[PDB]
Symmetry: D2
């Protein structure tokens, strides 16, 4: 071990570690979850520290040699070379200051190897505060997870569901309302519904981006921008947009709102919770569709991970959905409980919203590729049940009367025959209606209003 | 106390009641909460039945005498004249079919008083099903609640907060982070943050309207539109837009999504939940600011309705209720099956209550709390003059090196920057007292 | 439209209103939800005011003619005769002081009609504060809801489920795991599981009562009992226990915890949330088992209120959703007390008391109008159990797993019993008698019932 | 690397991996969270497989050399020696069958290193199924977390709060109701309330154990017990209780309820949710009482744990109350996830077990760890600003009430008005208005205005 110090005194630190005294104190203060920042969060802190040093350099506030060493070290952090040098618990000081110091200290150590002396706070934290940096890194990570990862994953799941809507356009089957047999639909129409739920999910994510992409950087300790250049925020955002290509990143509309609250994470988590609600309905219908092979609905077969496969992907999707709903409740709880100039629930809110992004992204692509794409429909079976359902007797009423339509439905169900065969077996053809009229009235695909 | 004849026997119905047998059976079946539809929901059911009758008349499917009687009876319901004719529990069949039939029966009874005979099903429910009517009325009610009521109430609260942000632009005070003394801010800056939260709230509600305003009407039993005209939905929506002025009402993008799911309600509830989260921070800050007057922060004085912060308490309690309602909505939203989500009456109760609570408490908070707040200006300046200071504004006078030495000695000896500058003998040609006091001025440090 | 003169001006009060100026101001201050206190919280406020007057009379603090007038007026409130005299919104001052004052004013107005003058504060609120009364009434109402109403309702549902478990003891059917076919169970075994869920629900409600029944009365403004007799709490609780028979009512273990927090309501709501979770599983299984009549599971028929919509399972799952939401609102209020007082009490009381009422009413309806009248498709369920690929495993030691897999495939394709398939494939002989086959494919024995 | 053969083809497995083909398929099937089972779940799966092998040996179903090898391998897993051999995602098949097979495969691989051949299914999974094992291990883990870790941690916090309540028995201060000035209390009374919240928290955990400790073992695939000995569950429970000392473990009252539902986890989460609600109140009150030191309430001082800021060099922050309130938020979210999973079983199996297990065991761990840290690094070192607190109590308008019977409520109200206006003590204001004489001696004033007696401390 080695001796390091801070404004509170002296601290023993692992002789080898890139982090310094403040990080070590936080390792000792917060042994709670045993989990630290995720790859996406460390990448965002690296991007931000690089962009700050670039702007400080551009404003002649920081020596070029120091800015260059920060930019190079921060690039190594953003690329993933130093993940082991972020040991601090998620459950740390609410502003995320410990993690901010962790980035500063690691950057200084990297620079030192390369012969450059950086002061973690006077150089690596120049023009910044703990209060504006950690939420900025959080909103970069959440915006990147929304734009670069979740939206493309939902688009892949949308396309797989729309492809089934088209493939199954004429696959007529029983409708089901209240779980009870209803007038006909097609599997295609039901999948067009699932596709619309996912398309609307993408619209929900896009609608939250004008506020999710807002960054606190430049507001310093309390939102006033004291101890930063007046244009720090607009300059740093311009660097982050050019480096990431995320045009959704923007300076906060109000510098006080951006630090006193995290309402943009609450808003975004509501979009994710809505997707989790949509995915629950889609996955539940699909596993019920596959149920059997004998005693269930046996409408479709899920691909094996023939008719006896456990619906394991639907199970993963509905478990992810449960986790997103829980995470959402934790996010709203932290969101509400800010005071005055700072919301001090940022590390916990960050853990939860980034996890929700990751789970939905990963499960959506698996569901699309390994469940949706390989579903096969029991087409003739579905049509035979639709043609045999008491639900389709209604259009006979005007030809044969209510009482006889009811007797047809009862006999068809008891004898396990089609409506068409029962109407013939009861001797109703000629008297009340012709074969041509019967085939028009009982055409189940026409009844589903599909072609 | 009259008796009626249902195809499972004899049903006694109160004599002044306009509902008939199906509604009276639903009253007997669902004695669960003892609360029925709200007036917003009754109004929306009246609007939908008048619009359907109009379109069935325009298409020649319904005789103009019957259409006229349905339209007149529907206008009375939409006008609030029959809010006592809807006795069915919220906790009813999950399609809302019972309340749909309640509307059909009341219109039939209103029509019969003017000498016209209507069949509740064949005439008043023509081209509609048991499953596309109650979700349509729910979305009409929620869209009206968002556009005509909530957004203007939030704008009133925004304008009250923004007016204080301007009044108090130079009312300097101490910042607080982690509840600890921080560098100066103004009371106006804090109120500018509150105003932005409510402005972002209005943006959040606006953002959900393209989906909240989607109506299922025309989809009939399963979403296929069987037994409705092909253009029923588009024609009914046009009548509803014309009659209500709500341009946000639209036909569903997908007629299956619009009946299998209520995801539009779940989305909208998320916006309301975010507003509840914002209101909690605003209300909490305001009651803390008003706390004391000896044991608290005593920064502001709330209007009296030793003043208890009763409107901040009402706001925070409303916020709690919107959070619970939101959880119930998401639970019902997720539990659809195949062609129908059967949680509609519960989801409707919860999202329409959330709209109403937020509307009503926002206007009360704006008018009877925010507008009348008074700042304790001299107290707030004394707190600002006790905040930590920084040496940065001395750099141009004593240089980076001396400024850094001032900062170190101030921390070590637990002194202010100001006293440390004086104690180090730094007052001279490089730095007058005037210049020290101008550089460290607390309102300049708030950068207003 | 009669008129009243306040400490702050004039107030118009409805003529047939028994409330006075403080209530009317609260009506004007809080037009938020349009919903006031429930019948159970009005009753509890009457109970509490009667017992407080009894004790103030017993200690010689209150003239007995005034105490008698309060006791008579409070009894009318407790008996539900004045449910229309409580117009204040739920969303009021967070201590429930407005509703406290509403009760004091209504009692004074009832007393006035019988010739007795009571000061709402000095007489009806004697020894009490604005902060220990409303939460005491909340905990009386919630404890009475748990003990007199919800437990007996849950016991009625338990007994209905258990009676089905016994009637269907030998009704063999396919198990289902992951929604896929599995080895046999009986409908009786499944209903015995539902019954245990409800019996465990009753255990969960019983387990929260030591803390749900804790009353703050006597703690006055901050929990110290300043301006009350030292034994006010134990005296008032003893009168409430004697009058109501509710032995679960008790003084708070800690008078500060009883006012700074409402953790007993949060605890109780968790038990109600667990019951809602159990009822969701039971109601969902029942509506799935009734699905059809052609394209669903068609295991049972629900009674009308095999084409019946499952309307009571829909009522039960909707109520369960409301209980879950209410539970989230209660926890939110519970967490956000400050120092000597939690000021979310009216919101918490609304939510907890609604949850109790919905679960009570829907459990009785579910037991009586759904569970009691279910009918099983007994022969059909046995035919599917006897035709399932899941039951060929006990053939392996006779014919090997490869021929057992061939039997399973042919039984499913030809829609025949495993028994008939084994006979049709010519496997009856020295390796397998008809009697040994019938032992190996005895699906009811595979379910291992009593 | 090193190659293997499934029934569905050839699988490559890391070289130092003790898992086999089924585990490697699950790794490829569920790349969702990148997080697998925690230490406590792995331990429980080890305990369970050892107890099962012991019972199968006792009943003469499993050869003793095979049982001894499973027992030895399972003890290594339960001792935390193999925490890196469970790579499967939490978000797996909802019965937890993947993690069950992972345990069977790791045990077979440990035994093979000692020259004994075990079939992961026919030996290590003997008398068990893919559905009654993972929920049994979940309930063992949750019961152990409640009894061995959380209750002791909560007791430590209770004792720290109760010690402050006693040290501060006479530390008089103004009450606060609605955040407004109220009549006197002691800091000791407030801390006795916080102590009771934590003690009630322990009572809530104890009250759930009769159902949390119920185990599905012996139920097999659908709860019937088919393909297992009639008494397998009571025999496995007897072994677990004897080896662990966990008296709360029991065989389920109903074998169907035990597999079709996880209501015991929903119930236990409710107790943890209530503790999070109590901890929120305690931690919020403490950081408010520590607020300032110049612009806040400055009632107490929290022990300094790390530098608060670089811009404000000497500012120190209530970091432990922030950790506690963040944990509480996580426990409330976790609780919502668990209830959601608990409600959505179907027929003979609830298929939300891995997700419900992750959330319930995380809530136990966060609450245990943060409770100990709050007790040792915050509560134990709090110091009260006694003279500040007494000065405010002695200047409070709220304390004029006991003057009423001497000078009347109108004159008492004038004393309060004046004191508050002129920033004086009530005692001094009563003097500066000449009221000491006939109706009121100087010692009679000091008896009426005794702020500690007004707090009515036992
Ligand atoms: C999950 O639903 C099923 C699963 C499998 C099969 S099956 O292909 O394996 N099948 C062959 C057909 C048959 C012929 C004669 C006797 C019995 C059977 C039943 C077995 C059918 C079904 N549904 C039905 O039999 C539907 C049904 N129709 N008519 C009714 O009167 C009736 C009464 C009660 C419940 C359901 C029914
Ligand atoms: C809800 O499940 C059902 C509902 C109704 C009925 S029914 O009684 O109305 N019925 C009579 C039997 C029959 C005879 C010949 C051809 C078709 C049919 C089906 C119609 C059966 C079923 N289930 C099945 O047919 C089950 C089944 N068995 N064998 C399979 O190979 C198969 C393949 C795909 C899907 C399911 C199956
Ligand atoms: Mg003070």
């Amino acid at each position: 071990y080695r001796i390091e110090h801070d404004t509170m005194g002296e601290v023993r630190v692992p002789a080898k570690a890139l982090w310094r005294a403040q990080t070590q104190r936080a390792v000792e203060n917060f042994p709670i979850s045993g989990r630290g920042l995720e790859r996406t969060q460390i990448r965002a802190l690296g991007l931000l520290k690089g962009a700050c040093a670039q702007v400080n350099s551009d404003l002649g506030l920081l020596a070029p040699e120091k800015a260059d060493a920060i930019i190079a070290a921060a690039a190594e952090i953003a690329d993933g070379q130093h993940d082991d040098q972020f040991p601090i618990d998620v459950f740390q000081t609410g502003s995320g200051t410990s993690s901010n110091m962790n980035t500063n200290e690691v950057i200084a150590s990297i620079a030192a190897k390369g012969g450059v002396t950086l002061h973690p706070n006077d150089d690596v934290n120049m023009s910044q505060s703990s209060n504006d940096t950690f939420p900025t890194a959080t909103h970069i990570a959440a915006t990147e997870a929304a734009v670069a990862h979740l939206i493309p994953a939902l688009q892949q799941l949308h396309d797989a569901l729309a492809a089934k809507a088209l493939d199954w356009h004429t696959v007529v089957k029983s409708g089901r309302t209240h779980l009870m047999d209803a007038v006909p639909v097609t599997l295609g129409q039901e999948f067009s519904g699932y596709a619309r739920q996912i398309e609307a999910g993408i619209e929900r994510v896009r609608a939250c981006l004008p506020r999710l992409g807002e960054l606190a950087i430049g507001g310093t300790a309390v939102g006033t921008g004291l101890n930063a250049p007046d244009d720090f925020g607009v300059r740093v955002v311009a660097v982050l947009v050019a480096q990431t290509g995320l045009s959704e990143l923007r300076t906060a509309a109000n510098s006080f709102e951006a630090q006193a609250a995290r309402d943009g994470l609450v808003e975004a988590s509501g979009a994710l919770r809505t997707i989790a609600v949509s995915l629950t309905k889609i996955a539940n219908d699909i596993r019920w569709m596959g149920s059997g092979p004998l005693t269930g609905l046996a409408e479709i077969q899920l691909p094996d991970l023939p008719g006896k496969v456990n619906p394991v992907l639907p199970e993963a999707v509905t478990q992810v959905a449960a986790q997103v709903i829980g995470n959402d409740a934790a996010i709203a709880w932290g969101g509400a409980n800010g005071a005055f100039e700072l919301n001090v629930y940022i590390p916990m809110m960050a853990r939860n919203i980034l996890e929700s992004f990751k789970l939905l992204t990963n499960v959506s692509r698996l569901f699309a590729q390994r469940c949706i794409a390989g579903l096969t429909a029991n087409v003739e079976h579905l049509r035979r049940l639709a043609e045999s359902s008491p639900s389709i007797v209604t259009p006979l009423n005007s030809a044969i009367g209510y009482e006889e339509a009811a007797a047809v439905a009862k006999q068809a169900l008891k004898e396990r025959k089609t409506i068409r065969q029962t109407v013939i077996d009861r001797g109703l053809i000629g008297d009340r209606l012709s074969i041509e009229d019967l085939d028009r009235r009982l055409d189940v695909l026409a009844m589903a209003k599909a072609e």
